[PDB]
């Protein structure tokens, strides 16, 4: 309250909810599983994502669970926020740059992951309209990065990879990321 | 039932269902997927 | 208990690892668990 305090429109929102009754998720960055990928779909991901002529997309979705044994009808809650990629932008041609193979590469992607989120009694968890009045440039932007480790023949299939992501601004939690939901 | 027929309330519980009403599910145990961990998340776990 | 398979260097990523349980006291059907489930 005392950091949205001078905003009147946010400050009556968070004024609307009980304090045991928002809750903070702290969804590990780099504590992710091997990814799993065919090598003749990570080699079209490759060249599409260079020499593409269309737009691509990338979907960022989250998605609640909540106990249905509370009342309540619709048990799940999920969202999705969409981002696109022009042909030949700075973002595409990075992350073409990215899985290379580079040591120590990373992108960053602005205004990506939504902090605050509403998760009503209904299956539309939308962010906060309010607490991010801008929409667009209040999401928090997302340094994305591809970890390699050999085992060991093929050059691209050779060896393990994975994906960590973190906060663009991170200090000392850069391995965590808060996400503050508000559940009616 | 009769391996639970001594004990009163097992007896009366198992005599409440109908034998095509319980069934045993034969999970397999060795027949799982492989383990897919990140090399830093399982060093991470062994060192916890 | 953990099954490992050599493939092929890292060491502890050089292979294939996976689970295997089974029930404590086991005579036969080692592989296998029962589960009696009661369904109102």
């Known amino acids: 309250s005392q950091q949205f305090d001078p905003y009147p429109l946010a400050m009556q929102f968070i004024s609307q909810y009980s304090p045991e009754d928002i809750v903070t998720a702290q969804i590990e960055g ?17 060249q599409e994502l260079y020499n593409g002529t269309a737009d691509i997309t990338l979907r960022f979705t989250w998605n609640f ?62 962010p906060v309209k309010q607490l991010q009045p801008d929409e667009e440039e209040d999401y928090l932007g997302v340094r994305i990065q591809l970890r390699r480790e050999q085992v060991g023949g093929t050059k691209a299939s050779d060896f393990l990879e994975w994906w960590v992501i973190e906060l663009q601004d991170c200090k000392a939690d850069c391995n965590l990321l808060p996400m503050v939901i508000f559940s009616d």
């Not at 799993?36 to 079209?44: E, F, L, N, V």
């Not at 073409?96 to 939504?114: K, T």
């Open 30 to 46: 780099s504590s992710g599983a091997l990814w799993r990928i065919s090598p003749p779909s990570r080699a079209q991901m490759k």
């Open 65 to 126: 669970q909540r106990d249905l044994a509370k009342g309540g009808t619709v048990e799940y809650t999920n969202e999705k926020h969409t981002l696109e990629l022009a042909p030949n932008s700075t973002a595409r041609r990075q992350l073409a740059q990215l899985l290379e193979g580079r040591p120590d590469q990373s992108v960053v992607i602005p205004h990506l992951f939504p902090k605050y989120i509403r998760a009503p009694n209904g299956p539309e968890a939308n």
